[PDB]
Amino acid sequence: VYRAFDIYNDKVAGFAKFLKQHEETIYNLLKDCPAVARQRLTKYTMADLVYALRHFDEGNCDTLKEILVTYNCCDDDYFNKKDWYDFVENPDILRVYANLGERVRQALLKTVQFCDAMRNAGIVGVLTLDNQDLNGNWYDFGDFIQTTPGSGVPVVDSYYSLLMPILTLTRALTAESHVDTDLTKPYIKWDLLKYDFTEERLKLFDRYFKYWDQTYHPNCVNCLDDRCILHCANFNVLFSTVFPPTSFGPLVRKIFVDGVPFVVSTGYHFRELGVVHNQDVNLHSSRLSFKELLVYAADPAMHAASGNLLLDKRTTCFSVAALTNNVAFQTVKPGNFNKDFYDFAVSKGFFKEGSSVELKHFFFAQDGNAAISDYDYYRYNLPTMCDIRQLLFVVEVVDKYFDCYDGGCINANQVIVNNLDKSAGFPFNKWGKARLYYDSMSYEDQDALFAYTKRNVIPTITQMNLKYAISAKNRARTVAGVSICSTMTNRQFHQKLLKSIAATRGATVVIGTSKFYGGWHNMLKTVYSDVENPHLMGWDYPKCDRAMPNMLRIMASLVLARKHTTCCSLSHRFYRLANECAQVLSEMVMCGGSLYVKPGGTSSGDATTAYANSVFNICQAVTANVNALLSTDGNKIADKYVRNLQHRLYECLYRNRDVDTDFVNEFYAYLRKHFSMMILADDAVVCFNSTYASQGLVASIKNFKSVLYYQNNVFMSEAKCWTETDLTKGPHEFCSQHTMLVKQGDDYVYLPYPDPSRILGAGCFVDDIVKTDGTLMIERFVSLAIDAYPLTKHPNQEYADVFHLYLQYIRKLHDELTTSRYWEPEFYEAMYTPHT
Amino acid sequence: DKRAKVTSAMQTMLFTMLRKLDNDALNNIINNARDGCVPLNIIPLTTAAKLMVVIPDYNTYKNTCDGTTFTYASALWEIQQVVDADSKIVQLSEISMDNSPNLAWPLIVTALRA
Amino acid sequence: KMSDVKCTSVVLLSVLQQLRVESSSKLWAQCVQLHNDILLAKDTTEAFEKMVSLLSVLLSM
RNA sequence: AGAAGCUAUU
RNA sequence: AUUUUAAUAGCUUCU
Ligand SMILES: [Zn+2]
Ligand SMILES: [Zn+2]
């Protein structure tokens, strides 16, 4: 009945579920190739396989279940296990998905043979997914126009691009690491000294994608623009799985300083950017300058080479070396107790049984294995090959969200450091802090180091450390400390654009907008805007920082650098992208005295983490809308304007090669009207036309579940997502705050109030012993009262008593201190008044 | 003066760490190069004269480093010292199924290149 | 009054770090697990036995 | 009424 | 051994 189809027609064009002698002459012309079989036709086609794996729904995954059993991927009783499809809970699903990768590979080879026969017979046509079998056999060659033999040109844009995410999900190219490309034969023992693999990359390209009508660059340093980088880097992630893992990373060259042999890094072999080479190398040198000596102490080339080999069975990641003679462990202290506050709280009618407010937030003690287990969570980071046609259209629409800011490069004297005395990273922390390096290396040295970064590559080590913070869950959390060498270059490159976003008001990205003085009301009014049938559908990202694909991280970094069209050349811009990948995406992480390899994901210490998170947040939200519009049947829409949008959206995706600046404007206007966003890093609140979503014209919660499955390798449950139908009460939760409508004079204004248990937990437990005496530090409880004041407006009487308890405890501290302003209940009323 | 002291602090580390490199392999492998370009990941895999193995449990220990000599990275390794998570020397007799619950995992195994 | 058990456990376990109990890694992990399970307990009755058990470990010296 | 420094809170 | 971003309160001096 309902089968997956890939249709382009007069008016209807989409990838949805539509219920279902010329060709005989064509059949004679194309009979020679073994690919052409309609006998031996599998109940399911390659379109059904790619449809189920792209639009995945719990309880409606019957098609995905029947295919897995039919092709002996697993037994039927595997499904009885609860949450089998969840990657995080059930990692064994990857082994089940990887068992039909060889069936995918045989389909790729049979496609080239079919294309070869169609070229030799002088035939022009377009390849679609629904014309194949799961075996790989081809049929459905009707709308093919004859021409002279030897000049036929296949069109393979729709077939290949849709099929791209399945190649890495099923691990189709695993057979290419075996001798003679046969699974039964042993592995290939590549030479340990090989790092080029350029010839095999072209052979891999020429065997699987022979007619991809675009020049492939094995090394991205030879690309033309940033849209070429995304195209060529996408193919590399599929070809980097074949080669041994020891080939990637920095490349070391022997150089001499004062006649003393030395080991430095003069290049880098990225899994995405191919192999690049530095341009300023000195075989023989002399007395080293500060900038040159600083670079020599930051690269992992000599740190790893002077250590000893390490074999760690705890972690499934890549171990490089062990700089220390033995592994080091560290534990976490439990939180301290404010007995005076607790005794006062229990006296004032609190903490009785049967009370709606209790104590739930604590500090949790951790053991030594917590640090390495949290690092081991990077096993959720998997090589993801994205749809490149979708990514090329989406990046333009996402970029239009960022066209109201001013960016560009700044000199070293236009840089603002928020907090100097934090850390300098590894190995710089052994000698000083970030203050030492800023005030020692001069203004001219800083610009030269930025200039040197535009013509070379700098790899760098970033340390990992633990966190001592309050939380309900006992999960450990780790924070990455980036080095001072990588921070200065990124500041001069991005601070102009980052400061502008934190200063712009009334935009989609709401970073830097305060919640005080009516800020909460203004942002909530902006997102409501002019939506016809408002509804709220905030969501959450499962395992955001560990499961981020590297393709979306590279795409986000290019958008942030789209503002350098004047100050930097294209050669200078590529060497900036190369630095970012070698210092954030994949790098050596010092996780407990031993060097490892970071497969990917975000780093806490990266300056642009929050802003790049917003770009990725918009990217998934934009992607979810285009998938919803294309998955909708084009013959059920009634609005003629949307149907033209739904038809031209397909054309701008697959049948085009240049940016269509006109349809991007229409699509951006369409989103701004019906899908209003409020974006702050991972958190997001959306006001959407409920009538459109019920018809399928905009993204829903289900559309986010499907996109997250194939573009993030994570499974989103219905627990952390929410939906509200009446705007009188605002978002169910945004940044861990609730909202309600209260009277203020003659005005109704939204107010943010936190969790009552969280506020009490902060007062009871402090992570420092010196904070026990509140007489010296009264300001801690004053700040908590400011956060907790809106609780007095709650209908629940037990909720309002938290502020009075906080307010009463403030008075009790003032008795020993001696003024009335802190105890004044109108001091906390001014912070939520529009007059600043 | 702040830039002067930090200059001497890190330039010595570049010179006092060249010496720490294993001289019996310094000439043996660091001197050897195919075309002056070699990946960095493989440098410790063949130049290091010392190996450290961290073992989570008994099942992994018997499957990887059973006996006094074990083969890994296409080379024979001779065990030198075994130390538990408490930083205490452990003799090879104690590692068995019977004494597995009494052991303080993880275990640190140190080898030496043949 | 259920939270009174959790507050007592928090101060009780912090005493062990003061007396330098971290030398015994296996013992340290055992008391951490018991303390964490107390904090995550849903029924008040279950937390009573672990609190006494945790108190006994302190009294072992 | 604005700068700048430190501390604390979310 | 303790990272990045943004918001606020307090206090300290400068005119
Ligand atoms: Zn290119
Ligand atoms: Zn620039």
Could you give the CA distance from residue A535 to residue A690 in angstroms, rounded to a whole number?
Answer: 6
Exposure b/e, A431-456, CB count within 10 A at least 16 = b? ebbbbbbbebbeeebbebbbebbbeb
Chain B stretch 17-36, residues whose beta carbon is closer than 8 A to a beta carbon of chain A: 17-18, 20-21, 30, 33-34, 36
Torsion of the alpha carbons at A492, A497, A502 and A503, rounded to the nearest 10 = 110
Could you give the CA distance from residue A249 to residue A318 in angstroms, rounded to a whole number?
Answer: 12
**Angle B82-B88-B89 (CA atoms, 0-180°, nearest 5)?**
40
Q: Which helix (H) or strand (E) holds A276?
A: strand A275-277
Contact predicate A408/A567, CB 8 Å: yes
- For residue B108, the SS3 value is strand
Ligand nearest to the CA of A450: 2
A497 C-alpha vs ligand 2 centroid, how far in Å?
11
- Return the amino acid letter for A773: D
Could you give the CA distance from residue A437 to residue C10 in angstroms, rounded to a whole number?
Answer: 42
State the resolution, in angstroms. 2.9
State the angle between helix axes of A570-580 and A550-560 in degrees (0 to 180), rounded to the nearest 10. Answer: 140
- Return the residue in B27, B38, B40, B110 with the most chain A beta carbons within 10 A, the one to mutate for interface testing: B40
Could you give the CA distance from residue A466 to residue A312 in angstroms, rounded to a whole number?
Answer: 20
Q: Is C29 in Cβ contact with A333 (below 8 Å)?
A: no
Which of C7, C28, C36 faces A364 most closely, judged by CB atoms?
Answer: C36
**Distance (Å) from the C-alpha of residue B88 to the closest C-alpha of chain A?**
12
Give the residue among A600, A250, A244 at the shortest CA–CA distance from B41.
Answer: A250
Phi/psi at C44 (5° precision):
-65, -30
Decide: CB of A764 under 7 A of nucleic strand D: no
Contact predicate A545/A374, CB 8 Å: no
- A830: which residues sit within 8 A by CB, 6+ positions away? none
Alpha-helix residue ranges (DSSP H) falling in A101-197: 101-120, 157-169
Contact predicate A165/A711, CB 8 Å: yes
Residue A759 CB burial class (10 angstroms; 0-12, 13-18, ≥19) = buried
Report all structural domains of chain A as residue ranges with CATH numbers, in order of start: 2-189 (no CATH), 218-228+242-324+407-503+551-599 (no CATH), 340-365+738-830 (no CATH), 504-548+601-735 (3.30.70.270)
Give the residue among A243, A239, A241, A248 at the shortest CA–CA distance from A216.
Answer: A239
Contact predicate A760/A357, CB 8 Å: yes
Nearest protein residue by Cα to C1' of nucleotide D5 = A419
Could you give the CA distance from residue A371 to residue A653 in angstroms, rounded to a whole number?
Answer: 44
A49 C-alpha vs ligand 2 centroid, how far in Å?
44
Residue A729 CB burial class (10 angstroms; 0-12, 13-18, ≥19) = middle
State how beta strands A765-766 and B38-39 pair. unpaired
* A343 backbone φψ class: left, alpha, beta (φ>0; ψ -120 to 50): alpha
The DSSP line for B27-72 is IIIIS--SSS-EESTTHHHHH-SEEEEEE-SHHHHHHHS-SSEEE-
Could you give the CA distance from residue A647 to residue B83 in angstroms, rounded to a whole number?
Answer: 68
Could you give the CA distance from residue C61 to residue C57 in angstroms, rounded to a whole number?
Answer: 8
Q: How far is the CA of A482 from the C1' of E4 (A)?
A: 9
Give the residue among A789, A724, A726 at the shortest CA–CA distance from A752.
Answer: A789
Alpha-helix residue ranges (DSSP H) falling in A581-639: 609-631
- Return the amino acid letter for A481: G
Give the residue among A752, A830, A834 at the shortest CA–CA distance from A788.
Answer: A752
**Range A210-218, long-range pairs (CB < 8 A, 24+ positions):** A210/A112, A210/A115, A210/A116, A211/A112, A211/A115, A211/A119, A211/A153, A211/A154, A211/A156, A212/A156, A212/A160, A213/A155, A213/A156, A213/A157, A217/A274, A218/A274
The DSSP line for A140-163 is ---S-EE--TT---EE-HHHHHHH
Other Cβ atoms less than 10 A from the Cβ of A21: the count is: 6
Give the residue among B76, B103, B101, B73 at the shortest CA–CA distance from B90.
Answer: B103
Could you give the CA distance from residue B60 to residue B66 in angstroms, rounded to a whole number?
Answer: 9
Could you give the CA distance from residue A423 to residue A178 in angstroms, rounded to a whole number?
Answer: 47
Could you give the CA distance from residue A677 to residue A686 in angstroms, rounded to a whole number?
Answer: 5
Q: Which nucleotides of D are covered by protein (CB under 7 A)?
A: 6-10
* A314 backbone φψ class: left, alpha, beta (φ>0; ψ -120 to 50): alpha
Q: How far is the CA of A494 from the C1' of E12 (A)?
A: 33
Give the residue among A181, A310, A176 at the shortest CA–CA distance from A244.
Answer: A176
Tell me the residue length of chain C. 61
State how beta strands A249-257 and A284-285 pair. parallel
Tell me the residue length of chain B. 114
- Return the residue in C26, C28, C30 with the most chain B beta carbons within 10 A, the one to mutate for interface testing: C26
- A550: which residues sit within 8 A by CB, 6+ positions away? A237, A271, A272, A383, A384, A581, A585, A586, A600
Other Cβ atoms less than 10 A from the Cβ of A181: the count is: 14
Residues 780-809 of A with CB under 7 A from strand D: 780, 783-784, 787
Torsion of the alpha carbons at A792, A796, A797 and A799, rounded to the nearest 10 = -60
Other Cβ atoms less than 10 A from the Cβ of A741: the count is: 15
**Distance (Å) from the C-alpha of residue A600 to the closest C-alpha of chain B?**
17
Could you give the CA distance from residue A81 to residue A66 in angstroms, rounded to a whole number?
Answer: 16
* Count of structural domains, chain C: 1
Give the residue among A59, A582, A722 at the shortest CA–CA distance from A299.
Answer: A582
| Side-chain-side CA neighbours of residue C30 (13 Å) | 13
Which residues are bridge partners to B77 per DSSP? B70, B113
A385 C-alpha vs ligand 2 centroid, how far in Å?
29
- Order of all β-strands in the sheet with A309-312: A309-312, B50-55, B107-113, B76-84, B69-71
Contact predicate A144/A124, CB 8 Å: yes
Contact predicate A530/A669, CB 8 Å: no
Two tokens, residue B33:
């190069």
Give the residue among A835, A776, A781, A779 at the shortest CA–CA distance from A807.
Answer: A781
The DSSP line for A434-500 is HHHHHTTS-HHHHHHHHHHHTTS-----EEEEE----BSS----EEEE--HHHHHHHHHHHHHHHHH
Residue B54 CB burial class (10 angstroms; 0-12, 13-18, ≥19) = buried
Strand segments (E) across A650-709: 675-680, 683-688
Contact predicate A255/A264, CB 8 Å: yes
- A778: which residues sit within 8 A by CB, 6+ positions away? A810, A813, A814, A817, A822
Which residues are bridge partners to A789 per DSSP? none
Phi/psi at A290 (5° precision):
-60, -45
Angstrom distances, CA of residue A778 to CA of A470, A602, A671, A782, C49? 20, 37, 48, 7, 38
Could you give the CA distance from residue A410 to residue A489 in angstroms, rounded to a whole number?
Answer: 11
Q: Is C11 in Cβ contact with A337 (below 8 Å)?
A: yes
Report the topology of domain B25-114: Alpha-Beta Plaits (3.30.70)
The DSSP code for A9 is: -
- Tracing tokens 């005496």 back to the chain, one arrives at A773
Could you give the CA distance from residue A63 to residue A68 in angstroms, rounded to a whole number?
Answer: 9
| Side-chain-side CA neighbours of residue A119 (13 Å) | 12
A399 C-alpha vs ligand 2 centroid, how far in Å?
17
Contact predicate A333/C32, CB 8 Å: no
Residue A676 CB burial class (10 angstroms; 0-12, 13-18, ≥19) = buried
Could you give the CA distance from residue A784 to residue A363 in angstroms, rounded to a whole number?
Answer: 18
Two tokens, residue B114:
């043949």
- Return the amino acid letter for C27: L
Angstrom distances, CA of residue A279 to CA of A193, A233, A265, A527, C20? 22, 22, 12, 49, 55
Nearest protein residue by Cα to C1' of nucleotide E1 = A465
Q: How far is the CA of A332 from the C1' of E2 (A)?
A: 12
- A610: which residues sit within 8 A by CB, 6+ positions away? A511, A681
Give the residue among A153, A442, A189, A399 at the shortest CA–CA distance from A294.
Answer: A442
Q: Is the peptide bond before A244 cis (omega within 30 degrees of 0)?
A: no
Decide: CB of A771 under 7 A of nucleic strand D: yes
Q: How far is the CA of A781 from the C1' of D9 (A)?
A: 8
| Number of Cβ pairs < 8 A linking chain A and chain C | 50
Could you give the CA distance from residue B109 to residue C3 in angstroms, rounded to a whole number?
Answer: 45
Give the residue among A664, A551, A553, A678 at the shortest CA–CA distance from A603.
Answer: A553
* Domain enclosing residue C44, as ranges: 2-61
Two tokens, residue A808:
């009463």
- Tracing tokens 């080239």 back to the chain, one arrives at A112
Residue A80 CB burial class (10 angstroms; 0-12, 13-18, ≥19) = exposed
Q: Which helix (H) or strand (E) holds A739?
A: strand A738-744
Give the residue among A331, A325, A287 at the shortest CA–CA distance from A308.
Answer: A325
Strand segments (E) across A563-645: 588-590, 594-597
Contact predicate A199/B49, CB 8 Å: no
Other Cβ atoms less than 10 A from the Cβ of A179: the count is: 11
**Distance (Å) from the C-alpha of residue C19 to the closest C-alpha of chain A?**
13
- For residue A720, the SS3 value is coil
Question: Does the CB of B26 have a partner CB in chain C at under 8 Å?
Answer: no
Could you give the CA distance from residue A307 to residue A325 in angstroms, rounded to a whole number?
Answer: 9
Angstrom distances, CA of residue A583 to CA of A216, A373, A589? 26, 23, 10
- For residue A333, the SS3 value is coil
- For residue A57, the SS3 value is coil
**Distance (Å) from the C-alpha of residue C8 to the closest C-alpha of chain A?**
9
- Return the amino acid letter for A352: K
Could you give the CA distance from residue A134 to residue A163 in angstroms, rounded to a whole number?
Answer: 13
Contact predicate A604/A598, CB 8 Å: no
Residue A726 CB burial class (10 angstroms; 0-12, 13-18, ≥19) = exposed
The DSSP code for A308 is: B
Other Cβ atoms less than 10 A from the Cβ of A724: the count is: 18
Sign of CA pseudo-dihedral A450, A452, A455, A461: negative
